Design a protein around this ligand. Structure first.
Ligand SMILES: COc1cc(C(=O)O)cc(OC)c1OC
Length: 283
């Protein structure tokens, strides 16, 4: 049933919680044995957050292929995304190796390095042109080319170098800066404006490798990001954009990664973004 009618009635009523919980109860339960090996212990930021074996990204490394990252593949909607945790001090190098092997064009970041007085991730990119970073473990180098600072987001151009072969690769870093410490944004406009810019650069397009998106854990914030985009897209694609059911798309995405969207609030945000979003691509 029509999204807005649905959202109007879930609100009126107060039921966001009920609905979130039902999604939670029917979500897929696939194994995660590799994440759990003992040898893979410093490569995981949260214990209740793992990547399924069947959809995890392997590092092209002969000694430890393990990384906390997942490939979400949406069939109908012709889109692929990689969702992953914020890098830890020992995985910084692995992070950048995946970007390279996966042939990604963009990197989407939805958190701040420090939120609520605590560290949420490592400072994994260089902050001055002349102050480059070196990934000894992975034989890669990272260089800051340009910065463009905005009110609600920051975009950075980055250059990766195979030390090995002197090969280079230009990467695009999209950093959403203003998700609040507590809660959800009031209005979705800014996040939507941030999506479209992501879209506009080609970073989600098929002639490139899949886009890498992270927050802290890689599932709440990050899940909102792609849920909203997929849906928007389906709405342009189908005959009746009124059939797209957000709850179904989410359960689907979750066949690929656990816990996409972490709170009822977060689910309701998701709706708003989609409703407003569509206002644009139906006019
Ligand atoms: C309501 O169901 C569908 C409707 C449309 C459409 O084009 O309206 C496309 C679909 O995907 C193939 C559907 O999924 C089964």
């Amino acid at each position: 049933m029509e999204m807005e009618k649905e959202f109007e009635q879930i609100d009126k009523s107060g039921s966001w919680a009920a609905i979130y919980q039902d999604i939670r109860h029917e979500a897929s339960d696939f194994p995660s044995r590799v994440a759990k090996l003992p040898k893979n212990k410093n490569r995981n930021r949260y214990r209740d957050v793992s990547p399924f074996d069947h959809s995890r990204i392997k590092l092209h490394q002969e000694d430890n292929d393990y990384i906390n990252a997942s490939l979400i593949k949406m069939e109908e909607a012709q889109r692929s995304y990689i969702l992953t945790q914020g890098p830890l001090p020992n995985t910084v190098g692995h992070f950048w190796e995946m970007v390279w092997e996966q042939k990604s064009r963009g990197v989407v970041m939805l958190n701040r390095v420090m939120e609520k007085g605590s560290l949420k991730c490592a400072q994994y990119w260089p902050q001055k042109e002349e102050k480059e970073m070196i990934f000894e473990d992975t034989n890669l180098k990272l260089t800051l080319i340009s910065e463009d600072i905005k009110s609600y987001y920051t975009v950075r151009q980055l250059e990766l170098e195979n030390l090995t072969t002197q090969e280079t690769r230009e990467i695009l870093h999209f950093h959403y800066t203003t998700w609040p410490d507590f809660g959800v944004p009031e209005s979705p406009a800014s996040f939507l404006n941030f999506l479209f810019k992501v879209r506009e650069s080609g970073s989600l397009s098929p002639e490139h490798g899949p886009v890498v998106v992270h927050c802290s854990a890689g599932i709440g914030r990050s899940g909102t990001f792609c849920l909203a985009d997929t849906c928007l897209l389906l709405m342009d694609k189908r005959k009746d954009p009124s059939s797209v059911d957000i709850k179904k798309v989410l359960l689907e995405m979750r066949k690929f990664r656990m816990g996409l969207i972490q709170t009822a609030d977060q689910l309701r945000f998701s709706y708003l973004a989609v409703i407003e979003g569509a206002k644009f691509i139906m006019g």
